[model samples]
Target: GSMTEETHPDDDSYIVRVKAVVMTRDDSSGGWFPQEGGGISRVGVCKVMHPEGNGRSGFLIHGERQKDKLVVLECYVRKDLVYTKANPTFHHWKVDNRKFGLTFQSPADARAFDRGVRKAIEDLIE
Candidate 1:
């Protein structure tokens, strides 16, 4: 059998997938805050999947749904920024404590990921 399936960016044997709203560190502010020059917000989808045995416990793949390529982000929750809840929906969570931050589109999305990722990290540490 010489045929191999064509790959797609959105394709994954996904452990968890969620419609996400995201923001990146303001490079000019040196990343202490979340706002950028325009203060415009852009939302995207995020998918977490099992690492391909390539030395990561997990991988966070996220970006526009139609775009063929997505950015790969580390799937870890930074402890430093866990200090406060600024609002119901703002500063939701930190990514890499330097790169980006994101929240789910729905509360169910948040709950599912909370359970899923906690388990993922438990196994990761063991």
Candidate 2:
């Protein structure tokens, strides 16, 4: 099965979902790295979600096994939120001054997820 998928409102509120290895900037220092722990500390599904009413739109990451634990960021796209392709299969972005990164399984999946986020942001603008 594909690691990335698009869904409509019927399926839920999320516009797109991508399976990724999530990474965050070390709190004590700089550089993107997964938290040191054990197995798969920050791997899960990342999702771009629609806005509620006229509010700002955003995306989130949640643990695959622990859905309740969420890393959410909601803000105006291109203003408070920006996405950057750091490398093939690797993407990094900043939201509300916090930086996060996602590593897709393939370059295609990474690009697909980028497009999905762009489309979602465009829709919010229009």
Candidate 3:
């Protein structure tokens, strides 16, 4: 067994994972406002097999998925930027006013994230 297995012999583990789409303060500086009641935190995708202590809870950002790791994140929905009906909806953004939170790790990640989120909101509204 490795150092981890030795330390936490009965530690729970996970297999699948997912990411939450979010934007930072700097990214939305000149874009739009925020929702005011939102937050962001990168979570791990896992499924435990416990009864009382089995349910589910999101951990911090982890470098690589492991038996014990917490997924980190950039930011979350702060304010409602484009919660308007008159506008196109897709060209809107929002935050809750906080630090220069992080969005994506790279430019490409951010672009793709923005596109999908905008399109989704647009599709739903329009």
TM-score of each: 0.48, 0.56, 0.28
lDDT of 1 by residue, 37-120 (tens): 222222322333333544444333333332334433333331222312344443344444454555445676556646555665
Best by TM-score: 2
Root-mean-square deviation of candidate 1:
7.0
**Alpha carbon lDDT of each predicted model:** 0.41, 0.51, 0.32
**If both were scored by lDDT, which would come out higher, candidate 1 or candidate 2?**
2
Candidate 2's clash total is: 0
Compared with the true structure, model 1 gives a TM-score of 0.48
Answer with 2 or 3, whichever has the higher lDDT: 2
Candidate 2 lDDT for residue 34:
60
lDDT of 2 by residue, 2-119 (tens): 3443322122445455556666674436677764321223232233444344465444433331133343322334323467778877777766456776667766567677887676
| Model 1 misplaced stretches (Cα beyond 4 Å) | 1-10, 27-57, 61-97
State, as a TM-score between 0 and 1, how close model 3 is to the true structure. 0.28
Q: Report how far residue 58 has shifted in candidate 3, in Å.
A: 21
- lDDT score, candidate 3, position 110: 47
